Design an enzyme around this catalytic site. Sequence first.
Site: not given
Ligand SMILES: O=C(O)CCC(=O)C(=O)O
Ligand SMILES: [Cu+2]
Lengths: 312, 312
Positions: A12-13, A127, A284
């Site tokens: 996703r990200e 969120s 070390h």
């Molecule tokens: O849904 C989320 O908590 C993250 C969404 C997102 O990628 C962000 O706000 O950076």
């Molecule tokens: Cu993000």
Amino acid sequence: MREWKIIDSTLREGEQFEKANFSTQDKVEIAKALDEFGIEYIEVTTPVASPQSRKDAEVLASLGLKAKVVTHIQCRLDAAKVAVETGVQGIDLLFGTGRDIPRIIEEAKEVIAYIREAAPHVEVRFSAEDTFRSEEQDLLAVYEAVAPYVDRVGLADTVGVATPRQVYALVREVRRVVGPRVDIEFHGHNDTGCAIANAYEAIEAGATHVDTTILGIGERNGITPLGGFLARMYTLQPEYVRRKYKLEMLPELDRMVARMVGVEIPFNNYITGETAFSHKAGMHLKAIYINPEAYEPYPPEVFGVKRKLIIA
Amino acid sequence: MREWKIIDSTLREGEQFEKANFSTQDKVEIAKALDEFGIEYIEVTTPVASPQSRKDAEVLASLGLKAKVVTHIQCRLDAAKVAVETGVQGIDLLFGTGRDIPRIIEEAKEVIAYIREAAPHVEVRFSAEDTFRSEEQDLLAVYEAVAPYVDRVGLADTVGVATPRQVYALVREVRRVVGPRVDIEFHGHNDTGCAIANAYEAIEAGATHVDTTILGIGERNGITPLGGFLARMYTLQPEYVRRKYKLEMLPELDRMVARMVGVEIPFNNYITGETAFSHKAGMHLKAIYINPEAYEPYPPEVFGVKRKLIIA
Ligand SMILES: O=C(O)CCC(=O)C(=O)O
Ligand SMILES: [Cu+2]
Ligand SMILES: O=C(O)CCC(=O)C(=O)O
Ligand SMILES: [Cu+2]
């Protein structure tokens, strides 16, 4: 305890990473390896993005993984409809960034109620975008009102500027208003070098879920990286972390993604970087011969790598 | 304020990087560029290490830089003698890791007294190795007794495992016992991803000096990186940071060192990485067109770089 789980967001990200172009098979490969590793959740791009993103979500949710597959959508009724139809096990709602709070609460609860009605077994997270820069009374008012209707609330350091004591403070306040049952998720960007530190503080404050991606890939310089996060948590909870995950798989996870997105593993990358266990200073080297624990935060063998001694 | 200075250690800690092999000319090039950038201190390898390290310290201390050149030695009389003879402007003492405290105090004060006698204008710093894991009563007892005789005390997260609230707490306690006149330096390794976060917390707790290296090079995965640290501090004190340093030089600093030590700048490297200002998500691109500040922690132009839009 200090109990927590990881939500991998590489699908996703990670798809928002500049050089990411995952085929359906790349995503299945990634998801199976994460499942083998023992990751608890795998988050995937919204099915609304394209016909292929929908298909990918449909396949991933039906792979029969032990990990829950969850999709990330805007907090909208139309997206929610597409989401439930994919068969995902969870939906991660994001309410996107002078508009009244009862209305925001009403809008959110409508989307959430639709999901409960259409698919009562799907886990729902809510969120608000850019959580740490939102005015705090109104943010807590929304989270307090929405929490009884969701399994989890999340906080997102969207632009990567939250500071560690700030994250700790706001997670504690969220935990206060949402109570002990509702889970708490942290998503943090790494623009100011604090993604791992902020995830750790979030957990100390009561967060139960941390978003990671392999090698931290994501928008801009990305988010909390899996390996760096595990190094941080291993030094504090070695028994827990070693039991939860197949830590010796970390090099293969990092290699797989680096290969797919066309980057090199950074030279200084946590655990798996060229240089992560290289020692050079005489004093070390002197101590490492008696005991390598003297200048090592964790044993390289735990993560399937080896130390280097530069005695030259 | 929140006033602080940077001690670059690229020519000390950075020399301990696996692939570092700086010629005298490499070091002069690095030191001049740091001085142009406006770095306040440049720390160099102990002159005891080899005849060449001595020579290098002698040259660097005599370059006529605006930055103070300081060398890092074991807390020993013999090393201190060599150190003063190099003409450095400062000496950074490290007391290396069931032995009594009055003796430790006596041993330290002896070395410090020698320096005051032989070179009253040289600035003296005292640190105990692995400061955050030392038993705290004894650590504070030593720092309290030594502080009246030194310009600065330092804390070192030698193995890269300190946590941010831990660093904050111990810096505050040190500041309590040493009083307001004595400066406080933080050196932190990045094994658990907290070097930048810990340096920031150290400053919030009252630290006045933070050690950095370009690209964070150093033993293992190295220490707080210059660019990542400046990104973190810029978002909090933009006026101060922009006035202190020539921020648009950061790409040339990172390129210079990457070239010398034979690494690529990590793809996700703070500010100067391939990917640091790449945007891809539709909703992100949508907002950046009206205002790039919407999804950017700091302006790329401040640091002499540019954003990338992946509209594909
Ligand atoms: O849904 C989320 O908590 C993250 C969404 C997102 O990628 C962000 O706000 O950076
Ligand atoms: Cu993000
Ligand atoms: O003298 C110091 O503060 C740092 C010495 C060092 O490199 C370390 O302990 O990691
Ligand atoms: Cu060090």
